[PDB]
């Protein structure tokens, strides 16, 4: 790589690139950071812990004019793979995590093109807070979210936007979580209904606050209730309906209250079974609990 | 020892680990990827995760890490920390909730020809579509998709070391038997960039569950309850014990539901066969 090693010396050693400074001509400007989220797989939703675990690939896009070069001068090299610790990064974190894992998991290489665009697709395992609505369990749907923002930089320093795609030379924003139809394996219990993406700006907060801006990726997910149906509802409902046979039993059999109290015991066992599977929230009584 | 010290000082005087180690930037780095499966730690039917202990043998050539053995006292090979040199960034593409890339940076074996052998350990947690239709007599085909995360095929080429994964040092599994194993290379080209193929090597493992645990603990009690269901019809009515027998069988099945739900996969892709048999027994009692 006479060429790739001559280019990196030119960019980083000769010109004195400083990864601490933002890529802006003056401090008053903000760096435009375009974000998109690809859902590799929905790992789980722990109802008791109220935690959503996801495997997501976060596409970052921003311009760094200090990392521009004339391709023809350097053997027509058009793109460079560099470590992420060698360049300025727009440190985006998952704000609404519930385990302290704010940052991406694997800090992969950045891709830097000759016209200054910095591409970066670090994959991450995240564990986010998803408050659970137990009202219609096991026929329930949940509304989880993945809120992304920067704590080291505010809206004064970076502007968060959605990634822009093209079709027939017409630009549109990517306002949804990207899912590869071929590579995506559906979760065994949760079906994705909606998966929007939004840029949220709070007019009340000051511009120099980390809470001014965020990009939130939502997951409206519907439970697939076949397991709970087959294993709880049909046995429990049939056993409960079985109490009505005592009225048709003759009083001379001497086995009436035994049948009824045994049905009560079976219902208590089912209650014990259900008590392990949901959190002890007071917002509502679950449907199965009702 | 002094020859190796002088050699290592000479090699890394003006070395760069960020650039691909090729004489010309238009050359391709060929990485030979070989997967050694050490242990199948666990298969998670609920979250659809297969966790395995593996060795990811990687072999490439660093053009700049060459020396003449005659100039260094006949030293033909040395051991170098992996962090100091350029490496391929192999990633488990279908990682479920584990590490995406190698985290254990062991030393590499560097030959005088520039040939590097790196065999780091890893614990792969890979997503694996579990088909529970024939559970516990089910057969599962889970793979591990591996490829360079940030390098396309035009700069870094990958080829399997062998047609099959290396299972010579595979510890016996008490729950699964590997019927078949095979590694396939795949190349994907998109119309947007026809000259930049994207490569991966996918190792797949066909695994058959050992069902003796579920036969002993789940199926036989259900068969006993199913047999006990019919004996009430031979009891006399004047005994006053028919309801006692039937209701006690129902209560035994209700208590057994705790065992089954803690054992059965809590997924809704399909009804497990054990689930079908238990629903049969419950409905008919």
């Amino acid at each position, epitope marked *: 790589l006479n060429e790739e090693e001559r280019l990196i010396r030119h960019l980083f050693q000769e010109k004195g690139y400083n990864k601490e400074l933002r890529p802006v001509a003056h401090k008053e400007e903000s760096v435009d950071v375009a974000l998109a989220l690809t859902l590799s797989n929905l790992i789980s939703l722990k109802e008791v812990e109220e935690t959503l675990t996801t495997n997501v690939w976060i596409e970052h896009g921003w311009t760094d004019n200090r990392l521009k070069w004339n391709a*023809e001068e350097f053997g*027509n090299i*058009s793109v460079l793979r560099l470590p992420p610790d060698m360049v300025w990064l727009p440190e985006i974190v998952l704000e609404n995590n519930n385990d302290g894992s704010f940052q991406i998991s694997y800090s992969c290489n950045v891709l830097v093109y000759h016209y200054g665009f910095v591409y970066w697709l670090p994959p991450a395992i995240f564990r986010s807070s998803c408050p659970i609505s137990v009202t219609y369990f096991p026929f329930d749907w949940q509304n989880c979210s993945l809120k992304f923002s920067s704590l080291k930089y505010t809206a004064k320093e970076i502007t968060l936007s959605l990634k822009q795609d093209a079709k027939e030379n017409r630009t549109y924003p990517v306002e949804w979580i990207i899912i590869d139809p071929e590579g995506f394996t559906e979760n065994g219990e949760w079906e994705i209904v909606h998966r929007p993406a939004r840029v949220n700006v709070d007019p009340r907060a000051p511009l120099d606050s980390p809470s001014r801006q965020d990009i939130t990726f939502y997951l409206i997910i519907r439970r697939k209730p076949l397991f709970y149906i087959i294993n709880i509802l049909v046995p429990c409902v049939l056993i409960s309906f079985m109490v009505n046979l005592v009225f048709y039993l003759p009083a001379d059999s001497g086995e009436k209250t035994s049948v009824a109290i045994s049905v009560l015991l079976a219902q208590s066992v089912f209650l014990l079974l259900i008590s392990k599977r949901l959190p002890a929230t007071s917002m509502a009584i679950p449907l199965i609990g009702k | 020892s002094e020859h190796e010290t002088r050699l290592v000082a000479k090699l890394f005087k003006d070395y760069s680990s960020v650039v691909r180690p*090729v*004489e*010309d930037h*238009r*050359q*391709v*780095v*060929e990485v*030979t990827v070989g997967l050694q499966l050490i242990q199948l730690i666990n298969v998670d039917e609920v979250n659809q995760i297969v966790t395995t202990n593996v060795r990811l043998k990687q072999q490439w*050539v660093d*053009y700049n890490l060459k020396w*003449n053995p005659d100039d260094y006292g006949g030293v033909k090979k040395i051991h170098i920390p992996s962090e100091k040199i350029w490496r391929p960034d192999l990633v488990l593409y279908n990682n479920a909730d584990g590490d995406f890339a190698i985290v254990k940076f062991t030393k590499v074996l560097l*030959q005088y*020809t*520039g*040939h590097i052998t790196w065999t780091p350990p890893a614990i792969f947690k890979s997503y694996c579509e579990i088909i529970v239709t024939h559970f516990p007599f089910d057969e599962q085909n889970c793979s591990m998709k591996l490829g360079t995360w940030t390098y396309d*095929g*035009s*700069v870094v*080429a990958i*080829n399997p070391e062998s047609d099959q994964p290396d299972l010579s040092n595979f510890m016996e599994s008490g729950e699964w038997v590997i019927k078949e194993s095979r590694g396939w290379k795949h*190349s994907v080209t998109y119309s947007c960039c026809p*000259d930049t193929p994207y490569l991966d090597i996918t190792y797949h493992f066909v695994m058959q569950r050992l069902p003796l645990y579920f036969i002993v603990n789940v199926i036989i009690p259900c068969l006993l309850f199913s047999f006990l269901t019919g004996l009430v019809f031979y009891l006399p009515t004047d005994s006053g014990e028919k309801m006692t027998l039937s209701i006690s069988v129902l209560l035994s099945l209700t208590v057994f539901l705790l065992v089954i739900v803690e054992l059965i996969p809590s997924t809704s892709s399909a009804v497990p066969l054990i689930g079908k048999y238990m629903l049969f027994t419950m409905v008919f009692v």
Partner: antibody
Amino acid sequence: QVQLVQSGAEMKKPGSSVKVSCKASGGSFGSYGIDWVRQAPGQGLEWMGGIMPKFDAPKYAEKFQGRLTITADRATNTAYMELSSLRFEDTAIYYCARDEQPFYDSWRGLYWGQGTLVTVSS
Amino acid sequence: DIVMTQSPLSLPVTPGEPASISCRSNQSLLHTKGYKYLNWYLQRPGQSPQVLIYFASNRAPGVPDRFSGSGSGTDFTLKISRVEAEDVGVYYCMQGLQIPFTFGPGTKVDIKR
């Protein structure tokens, strides 16, 4: 001190086959960067075939298609050609040109063998 | 196929002075990335071919400083700053853009007298 050593000279009959090996020492070569070039007596160099990363499979000239099989083995550091249905004008010195690190789209000969003379005559 | 022609058919060379050889193609040898895929090879008498220049201006490792090359798409030139008596042989230009790759007829070099 990278050296490519080919197999010895061959005396073949028309319609037979010849397999020429190309073994390397002093360097590490891969599954690509292999090209076979023959020089007929009194004629110029002629490219026969080779394996490049872009095709990830051998490509041959139209003359040798259906008759030539070029393979490279990274494990043994050896490259092979096998020309079948040998004809009288297949008499030539057959060279192997190889690179340790292959170019994606084309090839360069930085390391050559000494050439293997194949004589096809009855 | 791309047709490669070299001039002169023979170049007689006075050890100590420069020399020049030219190649030609009936098709553009320019890659989509601007790389002119032409290689120059030397075959000394009784020896295997040896590369001197690759991609029309890049000197291969180990080749002495004397050899150099240049060209544009279809017209290419190989130059020797000073000719030494070890540089005698047939010089071949080859196109490496389109399969089948083709060598030129070959330009023979000999000591001038």
